[PDB]
Ligand binder design. Structure first.
Ligand code: SU7
Ligand code: CL
Ligand code: CL
Ligand code: CL
Ligand code: CL
Ligand code: CL
Ligand code: MG
Length: 344
């Protein structure tokens, strides 16, 4: 057990191992930047807020820790350390998580339009991380520019996985929290799968090429109209797959529209980028290109290396179907904290 020291930082008591120095607030939980004397990295340290205050909150704490312990990929957020000052389960109350310090997201780098070579490299890295995530049967569910960390060398990491249901008010109105969401999940058309993340990549790619949000709807229905104007109204094949009869009825109330010509929307763009966008932004989620397929698309010929695009170890999510008490979720979390093995 390392030696811990205490300090108060913006109305919060922090107790951390001596290896972490020069703590400075940067902003669920509270987050500080620090210097890790063991590895030489600048790191981000997150102290969880009220991790075991309800059943829902205890299960969410366990969910996040299981996920972060599993993700080991250059283009995905990973765990450098996890610790608690408690010396036993009976006194266990706080959880701290440590990862690399990531001070900028895709927004801060990019209302701006990038060169085609930058777009190739950034989207390639998102898809390389997604092939890894999807290989473990994980769905991110909330891909958007603010959830993509980028550094000075244009290197990218995916973070802030969907860990809980978003509130109804969070998704209301003219908000970027909804603009990158696949239509089938935005309107609850059907049981969704990993293809929802590819829709989000297409929205992000279009915005990097044009400098403009692709579907900036003022509400759910205005956004659906923007989407159907570009990709066309559904035919009977897709309508049958929409399980809600009321959502089916609404769609059939709309005047039919053909798919638009994407070369006349993304004027001047690389024709290979135009082709890839057509394969991502397909209304029927069964027919969208997968991450593994997209990495082999000719747009990425300068970066694609099939021997350097790894998959993940399998990931057991059976706990999601389990109903447990607060103290049981808390004891599972304690076990995962003390069994952590740091990376090389
Ligand atoms: N500067 C700044 C922000 C920053 O460095 N990033 C965004 C916030 C996350 C928080 C976090 C920490 C540990 C485990 C999971 C999540 C860290 C990376
Ligand atoms: Cl230490
Ligand atoms: Cl990381
Ligand atoms: Cl504690
Ligand atoms: Cl965003
Ligand atoms: Cl597992
Ligand atoms: Mg975020």
């Amino acid at each position: 057990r390392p030696t811990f020291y205490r300090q108060e930082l913006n109305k919060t008591i922090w107790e951390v191992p001596e290896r972490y120095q020069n703590l400075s607030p940067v902003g669920y939980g509270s987050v500080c930047a620090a210097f890790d004397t063991k590895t030489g990295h600048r790191v981000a340290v997150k102290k969880l807020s009220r991790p075991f205050q309800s059943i829902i909150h205890a299960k969410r704490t366990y969910r996040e820790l299981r996920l972060l312990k599993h993700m080991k990929h250059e283009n995905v957020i990973g765990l450098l350390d996890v610790f608690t000052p408690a010396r036993s389960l009976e006194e266990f109350n706080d959880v701290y998580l440590v990862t690399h310090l990531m001070g900028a997201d895709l927004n801060n780098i990019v209302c701006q339009k990038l060169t085609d070579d930058h777009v190739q490299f950034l989207i390639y890295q998102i898809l390389r991380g997604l092939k890894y995530i999807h290989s473990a049967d994980i769905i991110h569910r909330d891909l958007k520019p603010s959830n993509l960390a980028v550094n000075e060398d244009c290197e990218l990491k995916i973070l802030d996985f969907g860990l809980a249901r978003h509130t109804d008010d969070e998704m209301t109105g003219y908000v970027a929290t909804r603009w990158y969401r696949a239509p089938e999940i935005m309107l609850n058309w059907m049981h969704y799968n990993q293809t929802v993340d590819i829709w989000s990549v297409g929205c992000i790619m279009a915005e990097l090429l044009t400098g403009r949000t692709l579907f900036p709807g003022t509400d759910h229905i205005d956004q659906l109209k923007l989407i159907l104007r570009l990709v066309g109204t559904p035919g009977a094949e897709l309508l049958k797959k929409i399980s809600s009869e009321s959502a089916r009825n609404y769609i059939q109330s709309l005047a039919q529209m053909p798919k638009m010509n994407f070369a006349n929307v993304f004027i001047g763009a690389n024709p290979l980028a135009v082709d890839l966008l057509e394969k991502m932004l397909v209304l029927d989620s069964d027919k969208r290109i997968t991450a593994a397929q997209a990495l082999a698309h000719a747009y990425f010929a300068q970066y694609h290396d099939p021997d350097d695009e790894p998959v993940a170890d399998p990931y057991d999510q059976s706990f999601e179907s389990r109903d447990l008490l607060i103290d049981e979720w808390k004891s599972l979390t304690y076990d995962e904290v003390i069994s952590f093995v740091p990376p090389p």
